[PDB]
Design an enzyme around this catalytic site. Structure first.
Site, PDB file in Angstrom:
ATOM      1  N   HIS B  41     -43.215  45.548  17.225  1.00  0.00           N
ATOM      2  CA  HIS B  41     -41.994  44.848  17.590  1.00  0.00           C
ATOM      3  C   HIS B  41     -42.255  43.859  18.719  1.00  0.00           C
ATOM      4  O   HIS B  41     -41.356  43.106  19.076  1.00  0.00           O
ATOM      5  CB  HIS B  41     -40.835  45.814  17.866  1.00  0.00           C
ATOM      6  CG  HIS B  41     -40.835  46.522  19.188  1.00  0.00           C
ATOM      7  ND1 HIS B  41     -40.904  45.903  20.419  1.00  0.00           N
ATOM      8  CD2 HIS B  41     -40.700  47.832  19.438  1.00  0.00           C
ATOM      9  CE1 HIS B  41     -40.831  46.827  21.372  1.00  0.00           C
ATOM     10  NE2 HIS B  41     -40.699  48.007  20.797  1.00  0.00           N
ATOM     11  N   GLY B 143     -40.339  47.700  29.686  1.00  0.00           N
ATOM     12  CA  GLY B 143     -41.723  47.270  29.579  1.00  0.00           C
ATOM     13  C   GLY B 143     -42.673  48.436  29.317  1.00  0.00           C
ATOM     14  O   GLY B 143     -43.881  48.278  29.442  1.00  0.00           O
ATOM     15  N   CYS B 145     -42.855  50.204  26.387  1.00  0.00           N
ATOM     16  CA  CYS B 145     -43.247  50.343  24.995  1.00  0.00           C
ATOM     17  C   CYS B 145     -44.756  50.177  24.888  1.00  0.00           C
ATOM     18  O   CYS B 145     -45.347  49.375  25.608  1.00  0.00           O
ATOM     19  CB  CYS B 145     -42.529  49.339  24.104  1.00  0.00           C
ATOM     20  SG  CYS B 145     -40.728  49.486  24.191  1.00  0.00           S
TER      21      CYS B 145
END
Lengths: 306, 306
Positions: B41, B143, B145
């Protein structure tokens, strides 16, 4: 979102952990530049336990009596001395993975990460608070002596704790990296017991703020109170007194939530008098006191103005 | 003694974390050999997340659209592909700190360590568990991920989770390192939410053993029950079923303590219905279910082969 007992990343300290052997006693040491630091009680035998004569035991030892291993590599000891309860073994090789570091003495109420080790090999990492009675509620087994506690303050590894012993209540005692015990303890087998403990009020309030940031609000009431009146309730439930410094220290968490410190104090007063209504806050059914305001900030806020 | 929420040392995993920027999205990646793994993503804008066709979004991207950075050193991306929900960026440089590693898919009930990171920089490490409903109750900010979870056996890092998203309840979902999600979630902005969660019965029991081992006994009773009776009570209170595989897994602790598993079930049953009547176990007022039998043994090492 979320809140967990989070330790600092352990990588920089892992690369400093060594094994130190003297006779049949093995424990852990910390290797910074050309010096390995470890508990001086590694030079003891069972016959020294009564009244160990450390000064005498030290001089009687040769460099050769100390087997220092970093992984498989043997480090040669070229010198040995003593600062209070910590032994300093000078070695012929300087650690190339020495982080930028400082030795600091922490205060009661403050937290740090422990890297639990065994035979110079890291086993795990967890957060601890220095209790008001100068013990930590750690998790250590045989051979964990010399494990260290630390914070990462900017780029700098701030070493604050070296493990020496377990007291009979299952709590733990140790020194700073200059070899001075936290609390009234000594590095020998005598009748010593922890003083009675208190709950770290400012930490509890920080943890409540953390709950609010993560959407727990049920314990919020509309009440406010004064420092004075709060402190009277505190004392009744064995809570450390709250100070203006503490109020100042909670400012960042007040701003995040819009909840004045003294309002959170009134919420805490109500949880103290009436209990936690059978609920959990951040996956706990009692009031947690081992997170500082900074620990909440670093986990829940960061550098958000927006 | 003592018992703490303890993570693996993060050192081996710290040396694999890198930053991955595409457009204005920055998140974390894992650098193993000459491949960087990250959530696919990263290639989406906010708008794409609604109804994203990654196959098609990937066509739009060149190698030069990904900026990968290990500390400050840029790793040139020379290839990009996609396995399920994870992106694999072939880079020009093989990670010299690549540890021995496997990719494993864990099952609900099992625990692991999370190295929370930001801009490829490690922030903290904590223990989690794969919940019965395939979420984790982590602690992530903006931030995070591409942060990963892992176990460490010997020198072998077993990676089992990469972090992709926060569900609406504040709980966390992600994939194994082959890009398959745990549970029925998907990397798109949709109505999706977590199934209702249950407590991990076998973990609770292991923890109870840990408590006995560390001197907490007050909840023990002399009754024994049967699996069937126990599981009926379990079902009533949203506990996972206890199987005979679980009964055997607890055999070590049963032995060490001399408390039969089914005896312990009877103790749990009473706690389950009636609560703790204001007392604590291992410093907690609720039943902890995020320690596996293995986790317990590691912190409560036996004297069998001492």
């Amino acid at each position: 979102s979320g809140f967990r007992k989070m330790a600092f990343p352990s990588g920089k300290v892992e690369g400093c952990m060594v094994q130190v052997t003297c006779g049949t006693t093995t424990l852990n040491g910390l290797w910074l530049d050309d010096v390995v630091y470890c508990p001086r009680h590694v030079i003891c035998t069972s016959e020294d336990m009564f009244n160990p004569n450390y000064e005498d035991l030290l001089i009687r030892k040769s460099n050769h009596n100390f087997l220092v291993q970093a992984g498989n590599v043997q480090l040669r000891v070229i010198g040995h001395s003593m600062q209070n309860c910590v032994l300093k073994l000078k070695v012929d090789t300087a650690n190339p993975k020495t982080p930028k570091y400082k030795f600091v003495r922490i205060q009661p109420g403050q937290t740090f990460s422990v890297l639990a080790c065994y035979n110079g090999s890291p086993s795990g990492v967890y957060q601890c608070a220095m209790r008001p009675n100068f013990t930590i509620k750690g998790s250590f087994l045989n051979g964990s002596c010399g494990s260290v506690g630390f914070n990462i303050d900017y780029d700098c590894v701030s070493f604050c704790y070296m493990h020496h012993m377990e007291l009979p209540t299952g709590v733990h005692a140790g020194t700073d990296l200059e070899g001075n015990f936290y609390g009234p303890f000594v590095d020998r087998q005598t009748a010593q017991a922890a003083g009675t403990d208190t709950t770290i009020t400012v930490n509890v309030l920080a943890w409540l703020y953390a709950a609010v940031i993560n959407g727990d609000r049920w314990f919020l009431n509309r009440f406010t109170t004064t420092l004075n009146d709060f402190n009277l309730v505190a004392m009744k439930y064995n809570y450390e007194p709250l100070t203006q410094d503490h109020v100042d220290i909670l400012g960042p968490l007040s701003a995040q939530t819009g909840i004045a410190v003294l309002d959170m104090c009134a919420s805490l007063k109500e949880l103290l008098q009436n209990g936690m209504n059978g609920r959990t806050i951040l996956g706990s059914a009692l009031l947690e006191d081992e997170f500082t305001p900074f620990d909440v900030v670093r986990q829940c806020s960061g550098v958000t103005f927006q």
